């Protein structure tokens, strides 16, 4: 069975219990913590591409009001985010299973941009999601996995200084 696990869940859970935040910029900012995924049960010899996207966890705008994140009352449907291809793609099962698949080079932006960068809506809450796509093979196959532990609100600057401190402590 294809097994997908989150590396350093311990640390992600510290961020999550405070409400995690990720900076977005016009040029695009890398993520801390980095999404690192443990994958077992691939065909070592089959060919796969690893895809990352961000699901809008709800349809609301969030604001930091008197030291607390609170959703707006005016939901709007959230268009699905663009997909980031792990730059090791495509590659053999063996490659993907020999070390955690680490999305260290994805950049989160607030502006439609050249390419690579993933545009998110500021003050929306996001749930990272991967797709493992069997490529080249006779039968195309996709397996998808969500990472609740890695939810965050996209921000142009940190609101909760407890997050600022955790980010610095662990970077
Ligand atoms: C058919 C399929 C499905 C999913 C992912 C891929 C893939 O790994 N790339 C990377 C290289 C290319 C690019 N320009 O980034 C796009 C296709 C291919």
UniProtKB/Swiss-Prot annotation:
Annotated region of DNA binding: 11-171
Subcellular localization, as worded in the UniProt entry: Nucleus
GO molecular function: DNA-binding transcription factor activity; DNA-binding transcription factor activity, RNA polymerase II-specific; RNA polymerase II cis-regulatory region sequence-specific DNA binding; RNA polymerase II-specific DNA-binding transcription factor binding; sequence-specific double-stranded DNA binding; transcription corepressor activity
UniProt GO BP: anterior/posterior axis specification, embryo; cardiac muscle cell myoblast differentiation; cell fate specification; heart morphogenesis; mesoderm development; mesoderm formation; negative regulation of transcription by RNA polymerase II; positive regulation of transcription by RNA polymerase II
Domain of life: Eukaryota
Keyword Nucleus in annotation: yes
Keyword Nucleus: yes
Chief location category: nucleus
Annotated GO CC locations: chromatin; nucleoplasm; nucleus
Tissues in which the UniProt entry reports expression: Detected in testis, but not in other, normal tissues. Detected in lung tumors (at protein level).
Keywords: Activator, Developmental protein, Disease variant, DNA-binding, Nucleus, Transcription, Transcription regulation
Protein's job: Involved in the transcriptional regulation of genes required for mesoderm formation and differentiation. Binds to a palindromic T site 5'-TTCACACCTAGGTGTGAA-3' DNA sequence and activates gene transcription when bound to such a site.
Name this protein carries in UniProt: T-box transcription factor T
The organism of origin for this protein: Homo sapiens (Human)
């Amino acid at each position: 069975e294809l097994r997908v696990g989150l590396e350093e869940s311990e640390l992600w859970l510290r961020f999550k219990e405070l409400t995690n935040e990720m900076i977005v910029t016009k040029n695009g900012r890398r993520m801390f913590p980095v999404l690192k995924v443990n994958v077992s049960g691939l065909d070592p010899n089959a060919m796969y591409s690893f895809l990352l996207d961000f699901v809008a966890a709800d349809n609301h705008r969030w604001k930091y009001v008197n030291g607390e994140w609170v959703p707006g009352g005016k939901p709007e449907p959230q268009a699905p985010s663009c997909v980031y291809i792990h730059p090791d793609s495509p590659n053999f099962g063996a490659h993907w299973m020999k070390a955690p698949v680490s999305f260290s080079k994805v950049k989160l932006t607030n502006k439609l941009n050249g390419g690579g960068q993933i545009m998110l809506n500021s003050l929306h809450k996001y749930e990272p999601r991967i797709h493992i796509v069997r490529v080249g093979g006779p039968q195309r196959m996709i397996t998808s996995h969500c990472f609740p532990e890695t939810q965050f609100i996209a921000v142009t600057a940190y609101q909760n200084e407890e997050i600022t401190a955790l980010k610095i402590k662990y970077n």
